[PDB]
């Protein structure tokens, strides 16, 4: 590989590169909180690396050539078809939510790998600690069943326990009517079909579960739709935090070494996303799985390991 136990032995300790700027920041809010520009401006004032919010095609952006794959190879789900029919028969709701949870888990593994390999902090948008608010909103709106929530809670229970929470959680109070004003001024014809009760359930699960449970294990910052416009006040509030909560304090070189060994092996990160709980919204039968897998192999640069594809121009294969 690149980093293993031997590099840890030979001197590559991760608290040597861990400065005070090395913080994990997650910016949160409702569907049109406008927090993307807040996350990018906070990331450029503090000198951090911004990660955009992981969609369906995040794994497509990190693997291969970075261009998005067809949706049959990645996702098998549509955000627009969730917006149009949230109570759809084919089970797009929980299947979209589960693929997005795995995408945010892959993004969080990338974020920790960057933070622990470079010592540069990371600003994230709606991490895996806040992904469950859409699950609970979709369950309160009857868009998914209870067994889908049980499947999500199993996957989350066996995956989120292996990671450290962010340092700073920035929540943006934007009310439902302002969110809908921004949805109608956005002009997205699928996104304008979102009901008010769904946005209200998102805000309720946020204010009632997420921030009360993250306020113990991290430092939450909370802003309105106008005091989050000024990025410098938010960055000033970040730089004058007395970091004293959460499990980042009792992290020596060994625990962060084990974490860095975890977040570089992506199949171990993504191991328990596909647990064999045969839930019909995400269970793909054998003929469709076989056919889609054989078609995924025929995609260019995907038939072999990344250094080993003549069709995209990999040479010296006979000496590799």
């Amino acid at each position: 590989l690149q980093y293993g136990p031997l590099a840890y032995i030979l001197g590559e300790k991760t608290t040597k590169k861990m400065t005070e700027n090395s913080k994990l920041i997650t910016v949160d809010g409702n569907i049109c909180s406008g927090k993307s520009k807040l996350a990018k401006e906070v990331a450029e004032k503090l000198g951090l690396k911004h990660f955009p919010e992981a969609g369906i095609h995040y794994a497509d952006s990190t693997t291969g050539d970075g261009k998005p794959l067809p949706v049959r190879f990645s996702g098998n789900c549509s955000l627009e078809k969730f917006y149009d029919d949230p109570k759809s028969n084919d089970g797009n709701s929980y299947r979209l939510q589960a693929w997005l949870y795995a995408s945010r888990l892959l993004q969080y593994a990338d974020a920790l790998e960057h933070l622990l390999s470079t010592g540069q902090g990371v600003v994230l948008e709606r991490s895996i600690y806040s992904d469950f608010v859409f699950l609970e909103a979709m369950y309160r709106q009857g868009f998914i069943r209870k067994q889908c929530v049980d499947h999500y809670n199993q996957v989350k229970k066996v995956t989120v326990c292996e990671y450290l929470p962010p340092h700073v959680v920035i929540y943006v109070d934007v009310p439902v009517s302002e969110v809908q004003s921004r949805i109608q001024k956005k002009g997205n014809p699928h996104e304008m079909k979102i009901t008010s009760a769904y946005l209200q359930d998102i805000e309720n699960v946020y204010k009632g579960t997420f921030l009360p449970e993250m306020s113990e294990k991290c430092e939450v910052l909370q802003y309105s739709a106008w005091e989050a416009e000024d990025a410098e006040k938010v960055v000033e509030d970040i730089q004058y935090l007395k970091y004293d909560k959460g499990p980042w304090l009792d992290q020596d070189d060994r625990k962060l070494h084990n974490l860095r060994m975890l977040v570089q092996d992506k199949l171990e990160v993504l191991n328990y996303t596909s647990i064999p709980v045969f839930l019909p919204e995400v269970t793909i039968g054998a003929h469709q799985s076989d056919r889609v897998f054989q078609e995924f192999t025929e995609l260019p640069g995907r038939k072999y390991r990344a250094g080993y594809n003549e069709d995209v121009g990999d040479k010296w294969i006979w000496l590799k």
């Binding site: 072999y304 390991r305 080993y308 294969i317 006979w318 000496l319 590799k320």
Partner: protein
């Protein structure tokens, strides 16, 4: 069984009397089969890491083949040594004990009476 033979001189992979024995030829079918096992290990090693199976890592496939031939040559030397030891001990024990191995008075079938069982 033969553990008291190789107890006067312990942990010798090939003793000095193994050199009185002819070595396996390098065209031994056993050693060629071990080289085929090296080639198969190279193919499985290219397959489990999703490399092109016949093309990728010809240096690595060749080191698989070479390493299996190199180990198996000495394994065949020890195999032929231990069976030579077994035959040597057998023949010396038969020579030292003639009362336990009498030379059998062989009768021909003109004196040997075998009961005939008809298939009818």
């Amino acid at each position: 069984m033969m553990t008291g033979r190789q107890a006067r001189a312990p942990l010798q992979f090939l003793p000095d009397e193994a050199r009185s024995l002819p070595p396996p030829k390098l065209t031994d079918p056993r050693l060629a089969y071990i080289g085929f096992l090296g080639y198969c290990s190279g193919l499985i090693d290219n397959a489990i890491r999703r490399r092109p199976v016949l093309s990728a890592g010809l240096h690595r496939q060749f080191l698989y083949i070479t390493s299996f031939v190199f180990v198996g040559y000495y394994l065949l030397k020890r195999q032929d040594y231990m069976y030579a030891v077994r035959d040597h001990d057998m023949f010396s024990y038969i020579k030292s004990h003639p009362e336990d191995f009498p030379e059998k008075d062989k009768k021909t079938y003109r004196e040997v009476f075998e009961e005939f069982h008809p298939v009818r």
